Amino acid sequence: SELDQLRQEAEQLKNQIRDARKACADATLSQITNNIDPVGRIQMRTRRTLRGHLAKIYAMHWGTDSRLLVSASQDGKLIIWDSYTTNKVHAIPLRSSWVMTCAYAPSGNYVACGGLDNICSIYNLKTREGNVRVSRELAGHTGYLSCCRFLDDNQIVTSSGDTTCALWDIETGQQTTTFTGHTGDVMSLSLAPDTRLFVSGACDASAKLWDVREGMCRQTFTGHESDINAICFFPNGNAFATGSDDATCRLFDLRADQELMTYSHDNIICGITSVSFSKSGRLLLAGYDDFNCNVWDALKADRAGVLAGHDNRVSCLGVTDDGMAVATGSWDSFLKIWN
Amino acid sequence: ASIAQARKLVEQLKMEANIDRIKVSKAAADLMAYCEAHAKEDPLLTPVPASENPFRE
Amino acid sequence: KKILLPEPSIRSVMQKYLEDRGEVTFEKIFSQKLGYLLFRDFCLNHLEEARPLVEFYEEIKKYEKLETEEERVARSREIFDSYIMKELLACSHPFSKSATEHVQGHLGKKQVPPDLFQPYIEEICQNLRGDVFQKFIESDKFTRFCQWKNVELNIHLTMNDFSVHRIIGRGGFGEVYGCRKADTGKMYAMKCLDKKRIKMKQGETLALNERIMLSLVSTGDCPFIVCMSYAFHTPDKLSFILDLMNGGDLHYHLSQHGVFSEADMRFYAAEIILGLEHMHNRFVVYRDLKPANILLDEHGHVRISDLGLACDFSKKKPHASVGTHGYMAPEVLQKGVAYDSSADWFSLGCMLFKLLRGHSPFRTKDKHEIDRMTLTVELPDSFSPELRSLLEGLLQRDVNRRLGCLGRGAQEVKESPFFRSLDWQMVFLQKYPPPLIPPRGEVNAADAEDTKGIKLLDSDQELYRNFPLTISERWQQEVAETVFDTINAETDRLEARKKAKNEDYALGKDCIMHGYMSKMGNPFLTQWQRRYFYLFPNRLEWRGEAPQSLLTMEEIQSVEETQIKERKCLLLKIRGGKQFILQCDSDPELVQWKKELRDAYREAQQLVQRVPKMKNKP
Numbered sequence A: 001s002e003l004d005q006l007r008q009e010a011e012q013l014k015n016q017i018r019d020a021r022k023a024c025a026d027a028t029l030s031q032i033t034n035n036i037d038p039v040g041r042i043q044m045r046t047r048r049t050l051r052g053h054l055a056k057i058y059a060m061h062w063g064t065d066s067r068l069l070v071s072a073s074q075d076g077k078l079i080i081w082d083s084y085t086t087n088k089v090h091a092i093p094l095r096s097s098w099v100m101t102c103a104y105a106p107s108g109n110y111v112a113c114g115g116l117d118n119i120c121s122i123y124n125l126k127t128r129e130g131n132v133r134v135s136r137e138l139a140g141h142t143g144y145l146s147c148c149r150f151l152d153d154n155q156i157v158t159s160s161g162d163t164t165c166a167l168w169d170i171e172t173g174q175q176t177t178t179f180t181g182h183t184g185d186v187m188s189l190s191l192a193p194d195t196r197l198f199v200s201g202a203c204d205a206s207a208k209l210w211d212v213r214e215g216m217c218r219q220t221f222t223g224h225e226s227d228i229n230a231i232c233f234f235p236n237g238n239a240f241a242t243g244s245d246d247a248t249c250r251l252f253d254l255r256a257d258q259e260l261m262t263y264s265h266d267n268i269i270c271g272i273t274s275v276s277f278s279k280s281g282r283l284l285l286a287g288y289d290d291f292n293c294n295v296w297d298a299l300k301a302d303r304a305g306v307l308a309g310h311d312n313r314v315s316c317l318g319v320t321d322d323g324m325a326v327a328t329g330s331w332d333s334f335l336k337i338w339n
Numbered sequence B: 001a002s003i004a005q006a007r008k009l010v011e012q013l014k015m016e017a018n019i020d021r022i023k024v025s026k027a028a029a030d031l032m033a034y035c036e037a038h039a040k041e042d043p044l045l046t047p048v049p050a051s052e053n054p055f056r057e
Numbered sequence C: 001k002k003i004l005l006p007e008p009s010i011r012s013v014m015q016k017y018l019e020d021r022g023e024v025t026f027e028k029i030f031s032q033k034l035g036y037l038l039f040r041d042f043c044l045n046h047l048e049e050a051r052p053l054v055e056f057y058e059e060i061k062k063y064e065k066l067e068t069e070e071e072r073v074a075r076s077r078e079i080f081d082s083y084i085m086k087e088l089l090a091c092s093h094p095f096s097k098s099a100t101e102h103v104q105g106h107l108g109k110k111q112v113p114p115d116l117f118q119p120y121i122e123e124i125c126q127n128l129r130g131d132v133f134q135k136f137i138e139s140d141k142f143t144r145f146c147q148w149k150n151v152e153l154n155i156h157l158t159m160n161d162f163s164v165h166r167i168i169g170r171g172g173f174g175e176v177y178g179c180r181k182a183d184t185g186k187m188y189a190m191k192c193l194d195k196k197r198i199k200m201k202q203g204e205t206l207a208l209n210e211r212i213m214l215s216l217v218s219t220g221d222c223p224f225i226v227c228m229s230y231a232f233h234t235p236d237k238l239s240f241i242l243d244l245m246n247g248g249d250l251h252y253h254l255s256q257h258g259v260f261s262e263a264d265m266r267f268y269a270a271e272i273i274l275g276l277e278h279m280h281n282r283f284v285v286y287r288d289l290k291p292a293n294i295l296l297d298e299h300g301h302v303r304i305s306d307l308g309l310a311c312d313f314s315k316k317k318p319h320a321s322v323g324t325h326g327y328m329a330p331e332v333l334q335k336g337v338a339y340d341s342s343a344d345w346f347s348l349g350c351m352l353f354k355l356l357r358g359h360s361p362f363r364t365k366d367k368h369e370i371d372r373m374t375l376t377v378e379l380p381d382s383f384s385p386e387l388r389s390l391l392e393g394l395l396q397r398d399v400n401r402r403l404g405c406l407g408r409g410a411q412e413v414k415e416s417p418f419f420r421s422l423d424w425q426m427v428f429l430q431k432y433p434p435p436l437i438p439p440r441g442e443v444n445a446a447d448a449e450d451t452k453g454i455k456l457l458d459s460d461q462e463l464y465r466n467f468p469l470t471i472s473e474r475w476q477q478e479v480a481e482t483v484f485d486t487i488n489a490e491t492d493r494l495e496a497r498k499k500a501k502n503e504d505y506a507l508g509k510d511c512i513m514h515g516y517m518s519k520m521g522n523p524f525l526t527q528w529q530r531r532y533f534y535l536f537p538n539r540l541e542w543r544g545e546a547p548q549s550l551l552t553m554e555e556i557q558s559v560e561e562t563q564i565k566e567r568k569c570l571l572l573k574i575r576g577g578k579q580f581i582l583q584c585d586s587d588p589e590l591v592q593w594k595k596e597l598r599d600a601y602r603e604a605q606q607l608v609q610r611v612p613k614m615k616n617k618p
């Protein structure tokens, strides 16, 4: 039978990939960096507390000015905060209450959000006499929007619960490219610095690397034991980190096509909601469900520090493009700026 | 169940298999080299005085 | 003390309340008095497409109410030459071909019955629903309908809503007072029944059955039955709100006037027949027809009253012997023998003979003597041959030989040669002069020394749970003829000064329902903050400024109706063991908030369970 052959052939190919990976593991990242001095108890304090948002906060995103950030809350609102003075620049009332993700455009002229409405909504900010309103509603997914990120002011990449990702032309609203391959709800995506690739973590316990311009999946990373809730690129674009419900963060190298490091401790049991790298890529920050944010040494896997704010789940975080500060969003309606 | 789905999966695994990989020692060194080259440009690693720090005055 | 309409923001909660009951169809709003008035108020002033459609309807309803053929000939030409002929010359006549042929066909022959324009009635309605009825729901007139409908569904009467005056009726179970409803000023009668007099006399079954019988009849506005507008009860009294009849009954007037002549009794006969026709068209046998149960209004016209002994035979016929001795039909006295409306027509003949000769036909004070004399019939010589034929037919012992029981009902009695001189349309319009005009106010004009020593248990009160009632057709008519116009004008002024003094938070989003409620803060301080609440699929906000606090559907565990200070309120249980109690301004609001909040948290909690980013994990 042909269907039996195509299953046995797909099985042998998986073994061939596993052996090809095991042939590159001459050493480990732990052995390589066993000589560099540790970072040493990173201790940060809250510098700003962003008050508002009548309910849980689900997602945030920094602006390229390293000063403005946007957040998406359970109260069906986007707020564009000025981090330097905690002044609410814009308060956007959404047409749907079920919002899950948001994003700030690189140019700062647009913001996007979405959720169980299965639509990515592009909100314009430059129209005269204030009144920020929807400039485009991107419809095509058959599942909830989980994450979205801008390329320029005209292209945006989205990930949905329909086990797919997509690339949109904002001007015409067309779904330019569909990224099929996942078998579970796609949860998070991160863009590479050169913006020609992006990764994505899903509920099939696997991350995938996609070529934006060719629309195909290049490499597939296994290793986690449960849903992958967050994913973040390494500052140079050769590696990325993932946060999962298995209470572990993992570092994956693209050129080695396999996992390098596992960030875990026996006391930490709850899952990870968000991850981000510091400017130099040395620090790996991860938000947890135990109301804490942990700071990891990305090269030695030791625990550096813990951001011990908030009273409910830390649902999102992010480092500015200048590395000056770290913002954290929580289920307790607050955003805090750590530095 | 789908025959065309099984072809598309085998062809995809060929793509993931027929790539050029590097030794983990190489990839681990290049990462370590990036953190060293920019450790001084990282305000979280190296502390920054209060004048340059926008969130403290 | 007057009527206060709620703010137009009541529309959000009321429109959903009505839509869950299918009350927002054209067939159900057009046929309500206040609804018709507001619907035409919209078509005449706020719209030009349906303005000639409604004025056509109003000119037809005027034509139906024309009394003589001389007037119908002059009206049919005007309605034709305006709402048919002129519209047909402009080609914008939206009616079928058969409708014009029927009206024009009768006009050429010049035959003009009151139902001439009935074929147009069916089509004017069809042109008003589905299209004009939808633009009407969008307009401010349907909002005003929701305001008024909220008042009706929030009626809770007590003795303090009436100014009670003198006594006008005394019975075995209570009294009847003349009262004024301060709400609108409408004069009424109040029938108060003593529950403690009911338990001792074992009359629990009568009062309960009387309310059921009043409910079947008090529709359609019958001028010859004492109909009910409201029914309520206090801890020790039952109260019916009935038509005002302050002229005594006939049993009293028969003693003060003596027997009546044939011509004077003919008046009382005709009106009682039309009242019996009304009960028989609604499947109700009175079987208690006697001069004591016929009251007189201030002018001398009469109505039937006290339906306590009347029963419904729309599904099963009675057989028990119930009535007053001397008026019970032969098949009524015979226990085990069924009977229908035939019992009333025999009681009529007994009562009508009593008005002519002063006593029941079967009389001289023993009950068993009266039961036998009528079981298995001489008429005085001073009876006209047409009067003899009526009583002889009405007092036939065989049910197959009795007039009014031969397959046509009350029409058979009307066609008796005793009424050959009456125009029953003029009888229905109360156009015939009554014989006896009651005086300015006597004593015990409606009568027949022991008391009691018993109290009312909680089990006796359970028989009076479903006793409160409000007849919708009655309340709307009462308001339409009193304050419906002046209140609409006063509310229009208040809503205009509000708009001329003041961006809504609900539009453009996914809001489910918005309105006013009152949450409680500190109960020891009787603290009740009144905020405007907005219900969203996942949260419940409120403001007084923008909304500063809210409550999420994930937090809600249960929704329960409870009592707080003798007032029904909602109780919400929160995840952290906290409680949250709300209070509405009206009963429909509480019924709707409870239903929608229960559906919102149950649907939101089931949806969050299947979303990995939003649900709760160990």
Ligand SMILES: O=C(NCc1cc[nH]n1)c1cc([C@@H]2CCNC[C@H]2COc2ccc3[nH]ncc3c2)ccc1F
Pocket: C168, C169, C170, C171, C172, C173, C174, C175, C176, C189, C191, C192, C193, C203, C206, C207, C210, C226, C242, C243, C244, C245, C246, C249, C292, C293, C294, C295, C305, C306, C308, C446, C447, C448
């Ligand atoms: O108690 C009484 N009847 C027994 C029962 C049992 C259950 N419901 N009623 C009962 C009777 C009466 C009289 C007695 C004489 N004949 C007529 C009857 C009706 O009286 C009127 C008089 C003027 C009216 N204006 N509007 C209405 C109306 C009624 C009066 C009070 C009662 F409680």
Ligand SMILES: [Mg+2]
Pocket: C318, C319, C320, C321, C331, C332, C333, C334, C335, C336, C337, C338, C339
């Ligand atoms: Mg019988």
